[PDB]
Subunit: 268 residues, 3 copies
């Protein structure tokens, strides 16, 4: 039940076991990384550390290597000596890549054009429990050079893939995870992203530094002004029958659902 | 031939029959609503109203309840006592949901992640004559809480689904209907939306208040500046062979088509 | 190997053979146009010009007419008398339209809703070596009247299709070609577009005037500021193993790939 954890998930390289406990303490869910966070020469040591420094398997996911690679094979061998049951699959590009990871639960990280093109097949695969997107491998594999424009906003194709993943995940009832914010000190930019992610239905914002978790948790709580409105409209709705105008707005079922969702997030 | 009616379509709850004639007078097409506009407890009375206060079936559509619901069964039973032949299907999620509504004409309202993912299949279904998108059920079903950002623009996933629906509809020659504007007094925002809808090829902007119709109709006629240009380029084109530069712009077939479409709209 | 040619491709109407050598001199690759650049009445003459005034077939593409048209038939007949082996297919709408052009290499120009819906199938077709998108026929066929909003940006549906084609192209290892800039003297607007195109992984910006070519070649060279950063981060990486923080940013494999890609571009 990762769907009950909290929105602040945190990457930690698997070759840094001295930080595992810190990460577990700071975050709702830790993603121990055997992939791009760790250099090739350091992967074997990272795998040893996984086995030798267990976190709670109910709140820890392991990002393994891409399908068909020698590393993934070594990863799955190492995982056989752990109690970890959920993995994150990078460069997820087909349903088959997820299905071969049975009986583990899988979070598919779509971060290539092929993955975007196949997002719905990947989402529908049986072991999938969530979908994440990655802007940086996406731009890298497209042969590009930057995921953001001068003003910091994501370039269109990244914005496009983010929506693609959110819909693919939601269409098949999977968790949706938003991309990492690479500018560590940029709490302002992270706050804006997290608030928007929360508004559109993402379940999680993945973080790369523990200082980011409190920003993400706060961002997933609706503002005082949003909560006041949620309260007002739901109260007025108790006296109405069908569509009605409230504070100049046409309100009915899905709008009341937004209000309920806001109060739910405030409560939990 | 809804195709031949104006762009101003107007929802009216079916449990408000004293407003039917008003709605029919103000709008090009009326959508009598048996779904979210009407509370569950009032649906039977709305169904009775549908039978007892008929509107011109050549300019009226009935939004029924979602596929697989007991409410949709009751709606279709009530529909049997009417002349209405076009229905709007909310939460359209598969070609099958549309096909089972034969022999009626169907406008598919895609307002869920699954709908967006399956948009093209829904558009290609035989009884489909139109596609609409719905931002609020979309966000609600995603688990989100806000369809628009602080400055009022639709969030990315809504913009994405809008374009998805326009393309799916056009690829199969269906009418495309743009989403409702819930801020009733926000004539400014409606105007902005409706002008853009007209410019990209939407056939209709759906309205929730009769005061919105005049705004939509005006927004769908190109501005004086656009029409002057259309006239100029087309005049110039009659003495042209192939691509040519007009007022510093490269002009060929599709640009001339744009100009003709403007003048056609001014004509209509 | 059009992939090894620069990013500056130039359309020239096939009924203007006195400009062929000029085109060839200015551009990296010339696209000789038998479609919309040429009026129907001038097409047979254009076809004679193609035969009578040959360009280097290793650096020339021919845009033929759409699938199923009498004009395409005549285009292919005319082409049998040339050494041209790559064609551009306008209004590309299915894999079948591409496959029937074997054994020639095909750049599929997607510029209709159907094309956008079928983009991945088109890209995957065996003869496809490139995908381009066309904003003006897109709006034209949707029944719209302008591809850009007041401030000059492309409307959403065009931005949507652009990303769609970039992903489809890249998912199947095809060249990705960005859309023409119709405002000839707007070199500032072209610069912005081309820089973004290069940043997200487009291989080509297609031009309609030889004055645009220098702008495009310059835009595909990363700025002094970006190159400075690429040098720094890659130098720093040779001292690191795995993810590291550089100048406040989380850095790992794909980001370093971005840097390498910038330097590769500066080298070319
Ligand atoms: C980028 C990174 C290497 C920075 O290292 P750094 O220079 O040591 O960062 P800081 O100096 O700001 O460290 C601050 C504190 O937080 C800790 N910390 C930083 N990142 C951490 C992480 N991902 N997990 C656990 N603890 C972390 C540090 O250990 C340090 O703790 P301490 O002062 O109590 O000893 C680190 O943030 C990191 O590993 N991020 C994740 C990278 C990753 O996994 N990428 C793969 C997918 S994007
Ligand atoms: C939101 C709503 C309930 C507001 O009702 P309201 O409080 O009466 O709004 P107003 O006071 O501004 O109404 C003004 C006039 O316009 C009429 N009117 C308002 N909305 C109307 C509608 N959708 N159809 C017909 N007439 C309408 C009212 O009857 C009133 O007429 P009158 O003065 O001649 O008697 C109403 O706009 C409505 O029902 N909209 C449609 C809701 C819907 O169908 N949602 C589902 C799909 S999104
Ligand atoms: C738009 C167009 C007709 C402009 O005509 P124009 O008025 O003659 O252009 P200019 O006056 O700026 O010409 C300037 C010079 O560039 C040349 N030139 C302009 N466009 C050229 C082209 N597409 N190919 C080769 N040479 C071109 C002209 O011959 C002229 O050369 P010169 O004066 O050194 O002898 C011409 O640019 C053109 O044909 N563009 C392509 C249209 C097209 O192919 N559309 C279909 C796909 S989008
Ligand atoms: Mg990655
Ligand atoms: Mg709805
Ligand atoms: Mg075209």
């Amino acid at each position: 039940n990762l769907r009950a954890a909290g929105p602040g998930w945190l990457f930690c390289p698997a070759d840094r076991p001295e930080r595992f406990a810190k990460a577990a303490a700071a975050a709702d869910v830790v993603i121990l990384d055997l992939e791009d966070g760790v250099a090739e020469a350091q992967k074997p040591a990272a795998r040893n550390a996984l086995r030798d420094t267990p976190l709670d398997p109910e709140r820890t996911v392991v990002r393994i290597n891409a399908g068909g690679t020698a590393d993934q094979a070594r990863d799955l061998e190492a995982l056989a000596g752990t109690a970890y049951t959920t993995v994150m699959l990078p460069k997820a590009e087909s349903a088959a890549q997820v299905i071969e990871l049975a009986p583990r639960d899988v979070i598919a990280l779509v971060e290539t054009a092929r993955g975007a093109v196949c997002a719905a097949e990947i989402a529908a695969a049986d072991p999938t429990v969530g979908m994440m997107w990655g802007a940086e491998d996406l731009i890298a594999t497209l042969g590009g050079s930057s995921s953001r424009r001068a003003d910091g906003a994501y370039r269109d194709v990244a914005r496009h893939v983010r929506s693609t993943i959110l819909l693919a995940a939601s269409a098949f009832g999977r968790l949706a995870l938003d991309a990492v914010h690479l500018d560590i000190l940029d709490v302002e930019g992270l706050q804006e992203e997290a608030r928007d992610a929360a508004a559109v239905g993402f379940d999680v914002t993945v973080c790369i530094h523990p200082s980011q978790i409190p920003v993400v948790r706060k961002a997933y709580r609706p503002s005082h002004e949003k909560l006041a409105w949620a309260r007002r409209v739901l109260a007025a709705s108790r006296s109405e029958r069908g569509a009605f105008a409230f504070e100049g707005q046409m309100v009915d079922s899905p709008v009341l659902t937004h209000a309920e969702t806001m109060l739910r997030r405030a409560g939990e």
